[PDB]
Each structure stands twice: as C-alpha cells, then as structure tokens.
Design a protein around this ligand. Structure first.
Ligand SMILES: *[C@@H]1O[C@H](CO)[C@@H](O[C@@H]2O[C@H](CO)[C@@H](O)[C@H](O)[C@H]2NC(C)=O)[C@H](O)[C@H]1NC(C)=O
Ligand code: M7H
Ligand code: NAG
Ligand code: CL
Lengths: 497, 494
C-alpha cells in the first residue's frame, strides 16, 4: 500500500523513514493461482519487500543451480518470530506522538506490517533498563509481601503489549525471562557481578525465588496478560563470571538442573500457571549439547522442561551441527528456540549503523541456519532504540531493527527489520520446515517450509556480490525459474494442489 | 628468599608489591620426602612445606593414583609475550625495578619462563601503526628495517631475559599485519587478505618478509624456535576488524604455507625454525586443522598447531583439542596466547583477582590434560588500565606496572602460572593420574626428564578437600587441598 521512503545515512543501504503521518506498509495477501508464484524481494540497492509474480513452468532444461523441494521430508514446526519489550524499547516508543507509536506497532505486529507473534518480556531490570530494580527490593522479604510492579511495567511495557496484541494479525505468545533476583537472595548481595542464589536447591532462598516467578505471572495476569513460556534464567553462565557488568544470576548446568527439579518446576506445576512452558539454558549455543545433557538426563528436571532457549552471540564459534544438531539428535522431543540476538555490542562497533545491509544479512543468515538445524523460532532483542543505541544504565549501546528519533517524531526501519520480515511475515505458527536439496555447491542460504494450509515458502539469501541464476523445483507444481541478485533476500510463496 | 608484601585493591585476594629495592623471590628433598608449594586466596604465595611419603594408607578418602607407565606429551614450556606495551611498561620502571620484574619471570629465584612470544611489528598492544616494510611496492624488501620498538625496547629486554634464565629460552614470532601494499584492502586493519593468489609476487614477498625478520633478529644475536603462519587469521575475515590483522580462510593459509611460506623458510638459513599453523581461538578446531593438514604439501611444512585461549569461554576441550589430537596425533598442539575475557567484548584490570588466577591454572590443567605441549600468556606486563593499547582493547596481565610509584604488582595470575612454569621443565612428560571417586579438584601429573614427579592440584571450590596421592614406587602422600588453593607437589621416585 505505501512504499518505503528511503534515506541513506552513508552506510551500505538505506533506512525507511516513518513519522506521525506516514509509514511503509503492505496490502492484504492476494491468492495467486496454482502454477504461479509470488516473490518478495529486498536488495542492498534499495528494494524493500517488493512484490512480483511469475509462472511455474512444467519443464526445465539447464545445468544451472537447482533447489529441489522435498515436501515429504518433514522437520520442526514453527512457533514464531518477534522481539523484546525492554524498558529502553518501551520508553523510546512511548516518547513518539500517538500516531507515530501506532505506525511503529503496526509495522511489527499487524498484517500491514511483518506479523510478529512473539514478545520477550524481561522480569524487572536488565541492561536495557535506565535503572536497577527487582519486584521485591525490601530486604529479607521471604514471604514476598512487598512484591509489586513498578511504573516500568504498569505504564510502559504492559500498555504497549496490550496495544501490540490488539493490532496483531495472529495470536501473540509472551516469553518471560529474569536477569537478577532481589539482591538479598544472592551470595554477592548485588544485581550484577559473580553470584548465585544463596544456599542450595530446595531451601528457603530457592523456594522464594521460584515463588517470585508465580508472583510475576500473578501480577501480569491481574493486568490481563498471559504468558506462553518463561526461561529458567537469562544467560545463567554470565553470573559465574567475576566482574559481569549486567544484572545476572549465576547457575552452573547442575545448579540449573537441581533448581528446576526441586523448586521452579514443582512451584510452576502446583500454581494456576501450570500451562506456562519452561525453557532452559537461554544462553549461548556453545554450551550445547553439554547443558541439555546435564539437565535432561535427570528425569525429575526433564519432566518440567519444554524447550531449550539459545542466544546467538557465539554462533560463529559454535558449529550448528555440533551444538543444535547434536542436541536435537539426543533430545528430539525438546524444542530448540532462539530467544535473543542483537548486533553492535563488540568493543569497536558503532552502536547504530543506520541502513547497514551487513547487519540485516547477519539476521537472515542466523535465522536460516537456525531453521536448517531444527530451531522453532527466532527472537530479536530491543524492539526499538534511540540513535545512540540506548538508553542503557551501563553504556552498553547496540543496534535495533527500529531506531526512534524523538526530536524529529520519526522512526527508521533498518535492513534488519526487512530481513526479519522476510521470515516473520511469511512463516506463520504451525509452518513446517521441509527438505530442500541443492544440485551443486553454491553461495546461497536457503530454507523451505510448508504453511499449515499446504502452501510453500522458500527464503533465499545471497550474501555474495554475484547474481546467481537459480531454479526451484516443486515435484507436484514445476520449476520456478529465477535469479538471486547479489546482496539480496527473496521470499517465494506458491500454492500447491 | 623474600616474602610477598601483600596489598589489597578491594578484590578477592592480594597482589604482591615490588619496587626498586624489594621483590618477593624463591630459594629437592631426599627419597621418602615430598615438597609442597602452596598459594591461597587468603594470601599464601608459593609457600614451601615438606612432609613424609608413607608406605601405607588406610581410608575411604579421595585417592589420586599416579600411572607412570601411561605416557603422554612432552612439554616445550611456558612464558608470555614481549609486546610493545609490555616493553614500554617495563622500561618505565627504574633499572633496579626492571631487573626484579625480569628476574620474577625468567630467573630460578622467579618462575623460570622459557618461552617469549615476539610480535613481528605492530599489534593492538602498540602505541602506533607500523610494519617493517611500509615503503610502498618494495617487493624485493630492500627497505625492510626494524624500528625503535624492536631495537631499543624489545630486543634489549629479550637479551636481558636470556641472561637471567638458567633454562634455554625459546622465542616464538607472530605477525599481525603485512605491509598494506600487499593487502586487498590496502589498510592495516579491516577485512583484507594478501593480494592475488599463493605462488605470486604478493605471497612470495610476504614469505620473504618472514626470512628478512629472522635475518634482522639474527643480526641482533637472536634465533627463533618457531614462527606462526599469522596471528588470528580469522580476524582479517571480519568487516571493520579494528586493529592489525591479515585475513586467511583455512584454505588460503593451507595454500600459502604449501606454495610460499614453507618452501621459502626451507630454502633459507632459518630452515630449522618450526612453523606453527592456526595461532587462533581453539574453538576454530578441528575444522582448521582438517583443511590444512589433509593437504600433503602443507602438512610437510607444518610442525604444530598454535591455539589461543580466551578464558571466559565455557566449552568442552574434548571437542577441540581432543578431536584434533585424535585426527592428527603426530602434530603437536601448543597454546601460543591466553588471556582473560572473550576477545570481542570489553574487560578491565582486577588487581588481586583470585578468580583470574584460578582461570589461568584451570586452563593450563585443561591444556596439559588434552595433549598441549606449552602455554604462552599474552602481555608480560601492563599498566593499571590494562594498556597501552591504540584501540583501547584493554585486558589484564600477571604483572601490573605503576610508573608513578616505580612499583609493579604481581597478581594471583603470576603465581597460578608459576605453579606450572617453575616446576615443569622442558622435556617433562605428562603421565596418567586417576581419581578414586568423583571430585571438585583439577589435577595433572608429570614426570621430570630425571624421573621425578610433579603433581599440580587446583581447588576451585570453597571446601577443604583431604586427598592422598599414590605413587607405586614410593608410597602415599597424605595431604589436604584447602578451598581456593593451588598446590604443586614434588618428589623423587628413586
Ligand atoms: C512524514 O513523512 C512523509 C513521507 O516522506 C512526508 O511527506 C512528504 O512531504 C513533502 C513536504 O510536504 C511532500 O512534498 C511530499 O510529497 C510528501 N510525501 C508523501 C509520500 O506524502 C511528511 O511531510 C512527513 N511529515 C513530517 C512532519 O516530517
Ligand atoms: C562497560 O561497558 C560495557 C560492558 C560490557 C559490554 C558487553 C556487551 N555485550 C557483550 C559483552 C560480553 C558479551 C559476550 C561475551 C562472550 N559470551 C559468553 C562467554 O557467553 C557471550 C556474551 N556480550 C554479547 N559485554 C558492553 C559495554
Ligand atoms: C620498597 O618496598 C619495601 C618493602 O615493602 C619497603 O621497605 C621500601 O621502603 C620500599 N621502597 C620505596 C622506595 O618505596
Ligand atoms: Cl578461545
């Protein structure tokens, strides 16, 4: 319906400029006839999820790259895609005028946008908070008599989550994760640095901490918000490092295993929130398969664990096959879910690089690899940040798919937004990854899925400078003859019989 | 010979204060007696005590049994890097303070280092950018020369280190970047590799640069044990990599070694210098070794695999070192650089950190238990900010120099390193050591070239662990490993 208003900030590609009266959007889906396909294309040169259509041919003659669909080779079912409602993201969004806020929320959550169906919600403060706090800061309040949600929840996160669900196309799943417990429950008495819960699983400290999760879920339920899942701790391995600068709570895999079995698992199961899923790990995949083996070989722990949450930061050091692949081989019934990702955190990195095609490609390469290795969903970090990549109470400034410019009542949709949308918009919950084989070695990243209705979706990413002529074969429909231009991402859709 | 002058900076343990006139220093018992060197978080610094080895042991307590006929790798040694930053910090002290610092590391009154890693020109731990051949398009390397960093700082200091050492010291050289006129991006840093392809003028000139370097240091009466093919070759593959780098995929390194580096070094008067591959994060193994070592032309020139160790990464060594040794048992593994943190993010100095000490010793034990022949620390000395560094990529070091007080601080990392370096001479062999029951201790047993035993025991837990060490030739060693302690046991076997 409305095209991208491009703006170059001097980096490799453009951003799309939005404000109080204008934002780029899509028209409702059309249903292209059997024997034809739809293509959505984004390019470094500036195209942003542009729609084209073409024929599917009965025949193909050539020696070129062929990608063959194998619809009978079934893999994982998709849960979804989304991002995090941090204090920083909520503050930024709400500092825009109300019409600009609605266009930003529609961009992410509506069918006119990219159809997010996951919101990650931190349990109290984390680095993208402007201050440190927990829900139970009165010291030694073991009964949690003074447990309460501050304005960060009641005035910022909760109102925005309600507005996102009201605008959403699809049912939205909320995921909760804690960074720190109250300081009086920790060995170091501080929100950050090396420290774990005091004592041992089954004791007063571990029982209070598990009850805090029920109190959190109760408080959100009083605000008409229900969670799909909770993680056992955000980055539990971070709390084992001396000088760790952000809110954390250290758990070795044995400690996580025992806390789940003795405290979190039974406390959750014996509450009105027993249907809420529990995800373990919520950390780097380099900790796999070892962390899954420690937790999931204990049946008292394994019985409470629905899935394994992974963060992307060490993916370049942890081959997918040895980590995700081996974890799936060992525990095929325990889903793998990517729960956090952001660019810009390395020591020399510019926090925000308005229009970076490289940062968009990093997102789509990650999503594809994860989908090729049994992962059921992918979650971005901050839904929005300012042009400095904040605010943040610890000067850790990073990038985000949407950058809010408060002084201009304007927001910018980065290449990451569109790279993520090439998946989120076209792969609804319940879609299933299917086989897709290449005829020869190639430089493309591709994945194929089938929608619940039987229609096909193929995402093709080209991270090379060269155009790659390509054919996609559906054994029941035919050959989709195409070209994957250098530095492009395409999403192909087509009806099947 | 002189005890630790402790000082706290608000961290878990103390540093040892040294100055122009004072520094803590050191001084084998008869068969039937053992020596114990203990360091504790509470303040003990490689304290010597002795005790009996008894013929009999009755009990159900933890038993570590020495397996002398189970022989593993032989040790090359231990040391650290003489970066520009290390040399500037050391030379900032008055000459008597510099000598106590150098004796701390290299003398027998110190911790007996026998390895010095020498960067070939600038890196991040430099105060400026430079190479040895910055005059453009000098393919014959006629304008190749060593600057002040080598001739006034590094070379005189290495000479002073070798004078103080009783053990032969091995030098190891590594380049960060080539001259920029040999690079695809024409820059010291960023994503860029050598121009063209192996066998050509660019690759030939770069191979010749290694020989010119070895020739230059040979004129300064310095010979090298080994060179690495490139410091962290994966770095120059990253867009916007912030400091000195030269990118190589494993395929490119394989072909440059096979076509240029290997033949050039073999045809030169430095043909005896060993060539080490990878010189990057151990997490890149086994993939990197599989690519290079499966090519016979590359395999004939590669002596070993140099690995880096960033201590914040929690990963199983069996997957990297273990699998690499299983695939290439005749290719030695050597740790060429280790330091705190996670490479790509930021850190600060923690004066007196016992946690960082424990990271070092836990890492050395892991390496030795997984066939690694040596362990090289990064910068030998840093200032209190963990510099100087031209891109602010600060990190901790075992020795911190405070110019304003003409003082230097010896960190727990120094002593954790010393529990190995001082007691494990070159030629020592790792031997089997078996635990009777599952435990919280990190332990390694080695045999000195003379047959004597050395056992290092690290206790990372808060609890005191009683234990017995069984040697079938001498008897039993009855001891206690206190919480947050590191011990080195020594005893004659005959
Ligand atoms: C919000 O963004 C829109 C889109 O860029 C702006 O609309 C343009 O405004 C100029 C000046 O009035 C017109 O000449 C263009 O034709 C408009 N473009 C479109 C596509 O309508 C709008 O002005 C911006 N609003 C603010 C307050 O900056
Ligand atoms: C003081 O300012 C700052 C302090 C710290 C920061 C800052 C920001 N992002 C960071 C880090 C460390 C990591 C890594 C380390 C390696 N990993 C492990 C071992 O699991 C994964 C996580 N990330 C992603 N530090 C930024 C700014
Ligand atoms: C050097 O250290 C020793 C031991 O602590 C002390 O006695 C002496 O006064 C110090 N010298 C200076 C110049 O500070
Ligand atoms: Cl590493």
């Amino acid at each position: 319906a409305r095209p991208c208003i491009p703006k170059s900030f001097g980096y490799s590609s453009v951003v799309c400029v939005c404000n109080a009266t204008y934002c780029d959007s899509f028209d409702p889906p059309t249903f292209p006839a059997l024997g034809t396909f739809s293509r959505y294309e984004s390019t470094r040169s500036g195209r942003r999820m542009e729609l084209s259509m073409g024929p599917i041919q009965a025949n193909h003659t050539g020696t070129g790259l062929l990608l063959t669909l194998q619809p009978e080779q079934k893999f994982q079912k998709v849960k979804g895609f989304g991002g995090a409602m941090t204090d920083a993201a909520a503050l930024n969004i709400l500092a825009l005028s109300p019409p600009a806020q609605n266009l930003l929320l529609k961009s992410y959550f509506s069918e006119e946008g990219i159809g997010y169906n996951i919101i990650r919600v931190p349990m109290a403060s984390c680095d993208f908070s402007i201050r440190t706090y927990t829900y139970a800061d009165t010291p030694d309040d073991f009964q949690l008599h003074n447990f309460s949600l501050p304005e960060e929840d009641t005035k910022l996160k909760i109102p925005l989550i309600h507005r996102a669900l009201q605008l959403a196309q699809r049912p939205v799943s909320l995921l909760a994760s804690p960074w720190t417990s109250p300081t009086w429950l920790k060995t170091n008495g501080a929100v950050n640095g090396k420290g774990s819960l005091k004592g041992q699983p089954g004791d007063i400290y571990h029982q209070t901490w598990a009850r805090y999760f029920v109190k959190f879920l109760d408080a959100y339920a009083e605000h008409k918000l229900q969670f799909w899942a909770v993680t056992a701790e955000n980055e539990p391995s971070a709390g084992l490092l001396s000088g760790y600068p952000f809110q954390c709570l250290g758990f070795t895999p044995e400690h996580q295993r025992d806390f789940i079995a003795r405290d979190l698992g039974p406390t959750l199961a014996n509450s009105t929130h027993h249907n809420v899923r529990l995800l373990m790990l919520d950390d780097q995949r380099l900790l796999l398969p070892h962390w899954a083996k420690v937790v999931l070989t204990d049946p008292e722990a394994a019985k409470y664990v629905h899935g394994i949450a992974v963060h992307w930061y060490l993916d370049f050091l942890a081959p997918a096959k040895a980590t995700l692949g081996e974890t799936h081989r060992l525990f095929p019934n325990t889903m793998l879910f990517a729960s956090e990702a952001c660019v810009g955190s390395k020591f020399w990195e510019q926090s925000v690089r308005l229009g970076s095609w490289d940062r968009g490609m990093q997102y789509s390469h990650s999503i594809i690899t994860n989908l090729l290795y049994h992962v059921v969903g992918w979650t971005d970090w901050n839904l929005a940040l300012n042009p400095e990549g904040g605010p943040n109470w610890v000067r850790n400034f990073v990038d985000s798919p949407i950058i809010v410019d408060i002084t201009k009542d304007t927001f910018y949709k980065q290449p990451m937004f569109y790279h993520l949308g090439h998946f989120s918009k076209f792969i609804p919950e319940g879609s299933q990854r299917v086989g897709l084989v290449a005829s020869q070695k190639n430089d493309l990243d591709a994945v194929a899925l089938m929608h619940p209705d039987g229609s096909a979706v193929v995402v093709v990413l080209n991270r090379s400078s060269k155009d790659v002529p390509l054919t996609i074969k559906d054994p029941a429909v035919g050959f989709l003859e195409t070209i994957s231009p250098g530095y492009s991402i395409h999403t192909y859709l087509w009806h099947r019989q």
